């Protein structure tokens, strides 16, 4: 029974682990929702608090610079770092009010993108320097569509930099190298970063697109770890779901039995949020300025209709909805 | 030219002192914008920064609790705090980027919700210890319910525990005391505050109800004051507008030349933030999860459209160019 689940707001160095071994011990895996607004991580937040489950909160290069503003210049991933570094604060100072574990945590950064992961990691150095944590509790880099040698190499020359701050890096690999990932390729990424620190996690291509899925080459990426590694550990590596958007239970069973910790959602999520919102063409008429065919043909304050707080709100609360489907559909639910 | 005019990011201190100074000596007032996300939040810095604007960025009670999340229970005050928080940082994360001085500010604060303004104030000096600058830039007590003898009195005790970190406190006063308010009762207020500090604003009732609108008697205050002071400045008294609605340009025009500074807008921003995602309903036919009624039948990807990040923008864009007019009329705009 780790610290983790008793805590409350985001979470940093070991907790992270203990909340991810726990996960492959009680055999459940944890949503990872990618927030662009306040009000985006509200919605994940609260659907997390309501079944008392931990989160995952990320911010994309894209939802980065989205947390700045799209009208904020970002051909030098400045907005991206600027509103990554906004979300961050932002997430921190809100989350322990909701009273769960948050990881928080950044996306897809692929290799042209280091710019912006080199800002986050200053930005992370700085906070570290302070306060004892870094400003976020887990980075990405996806350099999948390099070769697994320059891959590997450059997430092992950050991971250096991170371990300092006990932070925690997940790892895209793919099917480059000079089809699936064999486990021959995944285990090369363990022996490289494992020593530096355990505080990374895998995602590698199973059929996850983003021909079909294979979430048992997963386990089979474990078991070759197993024996190399000669434990008796039934969960060597920490393993990241990509892509999961149709799987079925019976996809998503055999992942975390295969020692999946967290599995992206986004796209998901996205349409969850809108229709809420868009659930707000029900009220088309009472919603252009002071016309209401509704009592008040032209002379109604629409004020109530129109106000941001009561249709923003439709869309947490049916991102949320989602949400909570996935992290039952995950077995998170219920586990603090 | 005060420093502040060169400042980007949110600005303590007298450097709000100099704006409205400034504001007043060149005969502009700024507006005052709620906010209640990272999204909205974006539409006034991007407004502002594009109008060579300072601007003024403010929580409602209301919009606080939204910044917290509508689901965070608020009976304690408890939202409001949070919110306000997390607000305080993600604002004064992101405002640098823009390039122009912030106010952060707070709104309206009656008897019933001191709660909500002593754990704002609480988290002020705890964050003034730490870093030099308390969160906010500025906090209003709106008490006008209360005998006028109990409202200089309880704005006297918060301001004397303000003035230490130099925060500024604007005050509300109505028409109670033990029709519009008097030059008399608003001296009174000036002849208390003064005394612990000069960063105060003073709100008047003069038919901006929130029978009709006196904008004359703002000048009133300022010729009461000069006289029972002394002074030789037409200006002695920093004037605030409240519910300043559909108010012609004349009128407006008649209080800025009084010494408003800062001028609240709100419900239209409401509006204006809406319409352009409202307008979003003519793209209802591609906004079901994989039906889409321009390309191929029941099987294209309506993810580029429903992405919230193309949509919430217009909103942000249609808000925004609403901020733009009002900077116009107050005549703020390019005044950096
Ligand atoms: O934009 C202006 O110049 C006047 C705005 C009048 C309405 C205010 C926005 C809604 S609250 S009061
Ligand atoms: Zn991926
Ligand atoms: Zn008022």
Same mark, same amino acid.
């Given at each position: 029974?780790?610290?983790?689940?008793?805590?409350?707001?985001?979470?940093?160095? /070991?907790?992270?682990?203990?909340? +991810?071994?726990?996960?492959?011990?009680?055999?459940?895996?944890?949503?990872?929702?990618?927030?662009?607004?306040?009000?985006? &991580?509200?919605?994940?937040?609260?659907?997390?608090?309501?079944?008392?489950?931990?989160?995952?909160?990320?911010?994309?290069?894209?939802?980065?610079?989205?947390?700045?503003?799209?009208?904020?210049?970002?051909?030098?991933?400045?907005?991206?770092?600027?509103?990554?570094?906004?979300?961050?604060?932002?997430?921190?100072?809100?989350?322990?009010?909701?009273?769960?574990?948050?990881?928080?945590?950044?996306?897809?950064?692929?290799? /042209?993108?280091?710019?912006? +992961?080199?800002?986050?990691?200053? *930005?992370?150095?700085?906070?570290?320097?302070?306060?004892?944590?870094?400003?976020?509790?887990? @980075?990405?880099?996806?350099?999948?569509?390099? =070769?697994?040698?320059?891959? #590997?190499?450059?997430?092992?020359?950050?991971?250096?930099?991170?371990? /300092?701050?006990?932070?925690?890096?997940?790892?895209?690999?793919?099917?480059?190298?000079?089809?699936?990932?064999?486990?021959?390729?995944?285990?090369?990424?363990?022996?490289? !970063?494992?020593?530096?620190?355990?505080? +990374?996690? #895998?995602?590698?291509?199973?059929?996850?697109? @983003?021909?079909?899925?294979?979430?048992?080459?997963?386990?089979? @990426?474990?078991?070759?770890?197993?024996?190399? #590694?000669?434990?008796?550990?039934?969960?060597?590596?920490? !393993?990241?779901? @990509?892509?999961?958007?149709?799987? =079925?239970?019976?996809?998503?069973?055999? *992942?975390?039995?295969?020692?999946?910790? /967290? &599995?992206? !959602?986004?796209?998901?999520?996205?349409?969850?949020? !809108? =229709?809420?919102?868009?659930?707000?063409?029900?009220?088309?008429?009472?919603?252009?300025? *002071?016309?209401?065919?509704?009592?008040?043909?032209?002379?109604?304050?629409?004020?109530?209709?129109?106000?941001?707080?009561?249709? &923003?709100?439709?869309?947490?609360?049916?991102?949320?909805?989602?949400?909570?489907?996935?992290?039952?559909?995950?077995?998170?639910?219920?586990?603090?």
């Amino acid at each position: 029974p780790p610290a983790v689940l008793s805590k409350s707001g985001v979470i940093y160095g /070991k907790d992270v682990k203990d909340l +991810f071994d726990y996960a492959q011990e009680k055999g459940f895996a944890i949503p990872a929702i990618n927030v662009t607004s306040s009000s985006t &991580v509200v919605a994940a937040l609260e659907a997390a608090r309501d079944n008392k489950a931990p989160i995952i909160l990320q911010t994309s290069q894209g939802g980065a610079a989205y947390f700045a503003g799209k009208g904020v210049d970002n051909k030098d991933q400045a907005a991206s770092i600027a509103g990554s570094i906004a979300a961050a604060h932002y997430i921190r100072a809100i989350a322990p009010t909701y009273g769960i574990p948050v990881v928080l945590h950044t996306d897809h950064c692929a290799k /042209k993108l280091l710019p912006w +992961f080199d800002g986050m990691l200053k *930005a992370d150095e700085e906070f570290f320097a302070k306060t004892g944590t870094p400003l976020f509790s887990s @980075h990405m880099l996806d350099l999948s569509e390099e =070769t697994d040698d320059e891959n #590997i190499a450059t997430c092992a020359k950050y991971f250096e930099r991170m371990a /300092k701050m006990g932070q925690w890096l997940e790892m895209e690999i793919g099917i480059t190298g000079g089809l699936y990932t064999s486990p021959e390729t995944v285990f090369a990424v363990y022996e490289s !970063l494992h020593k530096i620190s355990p505080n +990374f996690s #895998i995602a590698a291509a199973f059929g996850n697109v @983003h021909v079909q899925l294979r979430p048992e080459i997963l386990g089979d @990426h474990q078991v070759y770890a197993k024996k190399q #590694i000669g434990t008796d550990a039934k969960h060597p590596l920490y !393993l990241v779901f @990509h892509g999961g958007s149709g799987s =079925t239970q019976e996809e998503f069973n055999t *992942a975390i039995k295969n020692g999946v910790v /967290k &599995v992206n !959602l986004d796209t998901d999520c996205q349409y969850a949020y !809108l =229709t809420g919102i868009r659930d707000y063409v029900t009220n088309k008429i009472e919603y252009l300025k *002071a016309p209401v065919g509704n009592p008040e043909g032209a002379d109604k304050p629409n004020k109530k209709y129109f106000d941001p707080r009561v249709w &923003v709100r439709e869309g947490e609360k049916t991102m949320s909805k989602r949400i909570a489907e996935a992290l039952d559909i995950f077995h998170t639910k219920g586990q603090l």
